[PDB]
From Swiss-Prot:
Native species: Podospora anserina (strain S / ATCC MYA-4624 / DSM 980 / FGSC 10383) (Pleurage anserina)
Cell location: Secreted
Coiled-coil residue spans: none
Outcome when changing residue 166 to A: Reduces catalytic activity 100-fold
GO cellular component: extracellular region
Catalysed reactions, as listed in the record: Random hydrolysis of (1->4)-beta-D-mannosidic linkages in mannans, galactomannans and glucomannans
Main location: secreted
Protein name (record): Mannan endo-1,4-beta-mannosidase A
Record's function text: Endo-1,4-mannanase that catalyzes the random hydrolysis of (1->4)-beta-D-mannosidic linkages in mannans and heteromannans. It is a crucial enzyme for depolymerization of seed galactomannans and wood galactoglucomannans. Hydrolyzes structurally different mannan polysaccharides, such as galactomannans, glucomannans, and beta-1,4-mannans from different sources, yielding principally mannobiose. Also has transglycosylation activity.
Amino acid sequence: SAKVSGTRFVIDGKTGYFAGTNSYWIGFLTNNRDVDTTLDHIASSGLKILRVWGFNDVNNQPSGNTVWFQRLASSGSQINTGPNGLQRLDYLVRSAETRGIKLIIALVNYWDDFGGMKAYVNAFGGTKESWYTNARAQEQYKRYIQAVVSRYVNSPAIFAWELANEPRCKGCNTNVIFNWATQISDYIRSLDKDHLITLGDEGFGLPGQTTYPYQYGEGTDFVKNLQIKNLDFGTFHMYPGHWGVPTSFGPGWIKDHAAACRAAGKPCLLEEYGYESDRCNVQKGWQQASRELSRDGMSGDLFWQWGDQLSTGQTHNDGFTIYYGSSLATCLVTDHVRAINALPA
């Protein structure tokens, strides 16, 4: 149900460009109806891919019925397969199977939200930069990958396994993440031969311009990582307001990634993007630049992030949320999906 064909994706046997979104919170909901209604809204919007967090790491177990997936400690780490643990991810997967949504499931965070590499450093020592070569942290991270992947190997709702959300190794030789991603993607492939696998990086480090995002200072080399055999497609993210570059850098950023993916013979996915101001105009310009490259390396995009109305009220507005039913969703979801459906075949 989710494959690659040259520089394009194939979902439900259709080859082409797909739109999707991100919802880090959907895998942690404890109300099944809130998962179903959010997926119904995403599916009715014509979105096919949903990127979620498949991690929830803590150093101390939270109180009450708070959801957690893994507790990390120097000795005795535990993976939660209970009702407030991975059973919440199981429900998301089953609800996505029913509703025709393909999930990208990231397996650790580079950032501290939901624990991240920081929670592993707290348990296993070292620094965030040494996390990739920290044997005890990598041993537990692989145990966690096995615990998640083994549950959904036979699900048609997995778009791709994703190694990490936005992995960086600040100031590291770019071989650190390259070697790490090679060994972890080979590990995931041993557990699941058929689903796609991707890195989850921001896409820093590649030719095109001399601005900050093109530099190798965050430990990644986009072109180098596209050579990894068991990574099926390239991912890149786009946040000019955090990166000291204008919004007008967007089309070139997209073009430069699509050219690298084209040269590698793999699809590119613009996996997160957002801007806080003049949102419709700014982000519609980027969606057009991406759609225009649909036969030249780009094969989809996911905005960050979905917003909805749950039993617990409106979901969080982090300045990038696009709420279902809003005028901004008509601009960046309805009109986008209609423009994708109009692309030549």
